[PDB]
Design a binder for this molecule. Sequence first.
Ligand SMILES: O=C(O)CCCNC(=O)NC1CCCCC1
Ligand SMILES: O=C(O)CCCNC(=O)NC1CCCCC1
Ligand SMILES: [Mg+2]
Ligand SMILES: [Mg+2]
Lengths: 547, 547
Amino acid sequence: TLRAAVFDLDGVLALPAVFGVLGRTEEALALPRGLLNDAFQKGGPEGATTRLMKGEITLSQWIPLMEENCRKCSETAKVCLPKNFSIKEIFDKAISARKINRPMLQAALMLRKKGFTTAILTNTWLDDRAERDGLAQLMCELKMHFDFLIESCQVGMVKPEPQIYKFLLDTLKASPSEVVFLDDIGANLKPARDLGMVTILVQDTDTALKELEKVTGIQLLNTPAPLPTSCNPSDMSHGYVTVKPRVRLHFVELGSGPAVCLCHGFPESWYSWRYQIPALAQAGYRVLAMDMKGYGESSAPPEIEEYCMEVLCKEMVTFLDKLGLSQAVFIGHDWGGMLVWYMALFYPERVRAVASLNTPFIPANPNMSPLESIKANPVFDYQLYFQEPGVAEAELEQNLSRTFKSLFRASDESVLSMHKVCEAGGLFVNSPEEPSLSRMVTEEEIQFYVQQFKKSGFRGPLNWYRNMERNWKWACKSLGRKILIPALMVTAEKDFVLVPQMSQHMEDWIPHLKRGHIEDCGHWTQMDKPTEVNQILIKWLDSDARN
Amino acid sequence: TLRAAVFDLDGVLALPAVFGVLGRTEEALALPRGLLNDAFQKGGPEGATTRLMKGEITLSQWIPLMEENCRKCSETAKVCLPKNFSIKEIFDKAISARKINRPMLQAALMLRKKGFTTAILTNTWLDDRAERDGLAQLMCELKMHFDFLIESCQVGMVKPEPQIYKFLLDTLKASPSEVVFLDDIGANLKPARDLGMVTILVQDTDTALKELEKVTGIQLLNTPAPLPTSCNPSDMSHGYVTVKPRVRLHFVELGSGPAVCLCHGFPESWYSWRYQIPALAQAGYRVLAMDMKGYGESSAPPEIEEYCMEVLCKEMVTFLDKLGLSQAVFIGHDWGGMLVWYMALFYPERVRAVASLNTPFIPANPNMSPLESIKANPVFDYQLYFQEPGVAEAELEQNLSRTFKSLFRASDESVLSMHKVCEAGGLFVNSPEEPSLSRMVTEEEIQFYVQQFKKSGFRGPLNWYRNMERNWKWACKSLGRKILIPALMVTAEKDFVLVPQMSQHMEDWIPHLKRGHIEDCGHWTQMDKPTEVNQILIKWLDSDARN
Ligand SMILES: O=C(O)CCCNC(=O)NC1CCCCC1
Ligand SMILES: O=C(O)CCCNC(=O)NC1CCCCC1
Ligand SMILES: [Mg+2]
Ligand SMILES: [Mg+2]
């Protein structure tokens, strides 16, 4: 029966309720009970606060008016107000103190994930305070999680006025019968209840969620920790920068703050950071998730040398140049990780900080040739299979869906053996024709990769493996250097190709290297342990890259 | 004969020369003359500094080595070094003290503008200091103005080694004969002189430029103040955000720092800010130059209501939402200016600061209808001509080149009479079929507008004028508000349509409104007085929008 849930902001999606700062201030100030509240509702429908809530005047215009009210209220009450009594001071602190009620938001998200039309109905104001950004960021984060956001000051109506509930119903495209409305102010529930829609008087969150869980018949409480926010491609800002006549790089951008450049591995895409893009943006950074040369909407020239590390890094430098960025924090995974270590070794000036997931920084061996070194590692056999131009391309391109379903698997869902590849004569030789769906990815996400790779195939992507000799000679130019800028290395316990122990010596080249380690995490780190990754990166960014 | 000019960095394009900080430190510290310098060149080709300059070790690795050298040099000299002697301290201050020698850069720019192949040849290091960003930003600004940047630490070679000069010649694709090289270190000039290329020992800039002017036969000194940097479309990062199913907004982005959203007028484009995009980016901001709905690469739906101010503003809010931006400074011109005032009146929370060029904020008249108000102003007659769907479209689209050449004109190049439009039955009725080229724009720039408008024509752009009634009713909702966030209003003396006096009352709605006024400046403000505009905006941004 129910199809939509509407949540109030103050006291429901955000706490502590700003409206509740009036009472707390009275006790603290030994003022008569309810004094500040009376001054707040002085005049009712025709009072300053209602005009404020309807958008007739701004918050800064309202402040002086609320002040006179407090005086007039203390006058009939025969009481004085402290000398440093400041309404601006009072609300500034209350507003900034108000945080998102995560469990309430989580419940909204769940209901929405299960087909519910969600909305926010709140009496609010046009905030033009010097500190408005705080409220802006909070609304910015909530907004994306709901189908609709109905703000009183925006629609000229305010609860309890029944007209706004009709507006709600019309916006929702649902009859009262199929709508549950949560509010902490009983008065606001009556109008909704009269229309016949379900209502929940929200005092304490748990109780409120128990009623909500009961009435909707969906688990909302004591539910498992959910996956972080994953962005939708069509809702992202897409950027394109031509770094060379035939080479254009594509990236998705979100957030403000220090620039953080994400560099995916093989055979992935910017979408491989879908879980950290919103998280890092949310943490105060300007995220630039790349489509590395050879992938997605980025150019994919056929020439092998177009993908040697030196060229790839120059291009990323040019990328910063064209965007007018003197630096960016570089965070890479797999092949992208190799690239950031080198960005730091050859262009320290442009790297604010560097971080790699799984991919350890290993210096070139002045003596042993790349081919030799690689043959000395059974698990790296597959890299030899990628050498001959065209072969690997045919196998990986034959059935894209199969390709990504076979590759993108958790540590214990494996179906491939990177060690017996050349021997087997292929990468999927003894792999299912129709692999099951990895717990890490949905059928939709798999198809996103599928469509991205239909554009350029695996030639460009595979070419990254075809410059061993060139990359070796280039890297040798840096054997005398050291990475002295902030650096983070995150190892993945169950990554059987890029094993943790491979990074054990890194300290010799990065003295102040900081670390991170994720257990029971395979090679596809971002997808596997998104929550751990975000927490590790954000912690690191806030302490070493933000300064 | 000459075809290329190569400039050294330290002492030529940047001053004061960092290399010259060694001597100044010796005097200040009463140390033996040349002591610090000796420690700097200790070992010659095999010394620490040469390895540093060749990219073998990083600057931070070099510091400790330079320290030991200073000790060893003071030992043979039988002298001690102050207790708080710090090489890091010394170079940090020197490096950050080093600024771009504007007159030298200006000369390079001129030569390049006249067909010269320009380049930078400098012995430098991989800077991994905690303060590297300073040098990064300086190189970031210089880089774009030259065809090539040859850094010693990047090519493993260093002056005076003749091999690097051959590398230079090869990179330049020019024989010695047609190359002039400027350096402040005589030793570095000999190798070049031996190959036969012209050389200039640069002590003082003026003298150096006199020699350069003489040898190239081009005015480089005492030359007029040049136009600020104007960006090239193909070198910009292009962003696209879908704000609604059928509406995608395009923008050009440059720089880092607070977000600054530029909103052009009618009938323009993001390219109308070509002169301020680099300037504002350079001043420490992240510039987002929009293609306003209905223009360039932004969507242009046919429906008239798709362009009423309320919808246009909601879309810009969504634009910020999708980009993960809680706020942006909004700077608009002409119709874009009208839009920012309203962004500030209805979404103060999202506007960090607001600024308008030419377009004054005028509140709706509760009594007089829009049509009536507009008819009461002879100069606004043209707005009536734009009402009938299709008419204005035909005239403006008939000959695009003519359209923009006729419109984009300085205060004293006018050929149109906005006042007798309806009477004349057209906008170009008594205008040249082949207007001359305005001093404000080149034939190329005119063609850029031409190609942009070939995509959607003037329907969408003209639709901005077709929502008077709707915009009026919407604006009436704000008659009780005031703009209390930082606001800037820049009037243009010779703008005969958006006249300065039209903004005289603005203070009544924006008490703390700051102002700016550009003399002998027409309607096309950005194009007309780019230098004045940049200076006025940057000054305002740094004091009111940066905080
Ligand atoms: O998940 C899998 O089974 C294989 C993934 C393929 N990854 C790489 O080839 N990484 C290289 C990055 C650069 C250093 C060498 C390994
Ligand atoms: O340069 C010229 O001759 C005409 C330029 C056309 N500009 C406008 O129509 N501006 C409107 C902005 C919104 C307020 C009314 C004027
Ligand atoms: Mg409430
Ligand atoms: Mg020099």
